[PDB]
Amino acid sequence: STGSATTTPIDSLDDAYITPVQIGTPAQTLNLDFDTGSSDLWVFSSETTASEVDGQTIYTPSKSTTAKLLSGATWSISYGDGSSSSGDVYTDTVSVGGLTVTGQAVESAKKVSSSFTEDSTIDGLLGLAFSTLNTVSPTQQKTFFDNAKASLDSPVFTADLGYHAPGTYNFGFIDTTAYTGSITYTAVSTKQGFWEWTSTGYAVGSGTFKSTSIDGIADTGTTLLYLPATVVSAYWAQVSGAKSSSSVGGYVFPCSATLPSFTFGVGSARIVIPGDYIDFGPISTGSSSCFGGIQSSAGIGINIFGDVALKAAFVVFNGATTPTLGFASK
Ligand SMILES: CN(C)c1cccc2cccc(N(C)C)c12
Numbered sequence: 001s002t003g004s005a006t007t008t009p010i011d012s013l014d015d016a017y018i019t020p021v022q023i024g025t026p027a028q029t030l031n032l033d034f035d036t037g038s039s040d041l042w043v044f045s046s047e048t049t050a051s052e053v054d055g056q057t058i059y060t061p062s063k064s065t066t067a068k069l070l071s072g073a074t075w076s077i078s079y080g081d082g083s084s085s086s087g088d089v090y091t092d093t094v095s096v097g098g099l100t101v102t103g104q105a106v107e108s109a110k111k112v113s114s115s116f117t118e119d120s121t122i123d124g125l126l127g128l129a130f131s132t133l134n135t136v137s138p139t140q141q142k143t144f145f146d147n148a149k150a151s152l153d154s155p156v157f158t159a160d161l162g163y164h165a166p167g168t169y170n171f172g173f174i175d176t177t178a179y180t181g182s183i184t185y186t187a188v189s190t191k192q193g194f195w196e197w198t199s200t201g202y203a204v205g206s207g208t209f210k211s212t213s214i215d216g217i218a219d220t221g222t223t224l225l226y227l228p229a230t231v232v233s234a235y236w237a238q239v240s241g242a243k244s245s246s247s248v249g250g251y252v253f254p255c256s257a258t259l260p261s262f263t264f265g266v267g268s269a270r271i272v273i274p275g276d277y278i279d280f281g282p283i284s285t286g287s288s289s290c291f292g293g294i295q296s297s298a299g300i301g302i303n304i305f306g307d308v309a310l311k312a313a314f315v316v317f318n319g320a321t322t323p324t325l326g327f328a329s330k
């Protein structure tokens, strides 16, 4: 089998991407944030504290003839950005772009943190990291990809995120028309539950490529590109007027600037992020200071190849017996 669904930026800045997902019988369509950096499929629901729902579409398990409460099961998650959610668990039928898993764990939120409430466009998350990170207790549950993998034509999914435009998540096949050149595959460590790989280096604009190993995760659920302080300093040093701002929380630059591209290495291959992809607009409404899309990971403990990086590439999440990651230009 295969599945294919269109993913769309939630706003003008590509802060996140949402993909329609069908849950239950009859189908309830919710727009979920596909997150290769986590492993829980959780949704706003008829059980979510009413004060914490503000425009999201909710899953109502009582209206699904295939929903079954998973007895005694609870979940609770906290994300790197400080947001949080928790609740109980059902199993139900879940379909993405024509691909169906029966008995998928659907984590129904009883509580969400303020940032989730404040984002009316995201009805929940669909985690696509490794199931070892799933938070359901006392019996850990599998991700949608893990449950679907054996049925797929090929045990892979692909992320093809658009810049200010729609894109595609495919399951079970590689669309050879969706990229230029070849796909370069690179090793993955699953030891921390992430799609963790080692970039071979970077360049800033037309500058000399620096060969250096950068360990990081491919995370579609993180907006920005978080890299070591030395690398980020070298990038922003090329932007007239750019500075690290303690009050704003990262590197900012004059909105009148044209940004240089950023290249990262994948083996011997190179992925070029256009400079415009690094502009995240005014720091506050009407400001002429703009927020940078490349920021330091120093306060994280891991580098994060988030949407800024991933949207510049066609990305293969290869769930073969030994997982690997593939990147192609596009
Ligand atoms: C541009 N923008 C909205 C931002 C401005 C100031 C600080 C930010 C910190 C993290 C993430 C942001 N996003 C891009 C959503 C920030």
Ligand SMILES: [Cl-]
Residues within 6 Å of the ligand: 001, 098, 099, 100, 101
């Ligand atoms: Cl199917």
Ligand SMILES: [Cl-]
Residues within 6 Å of the ligand: 200, 211, 265, 267, 268, 269
């Ligand atoms: Cl190299």
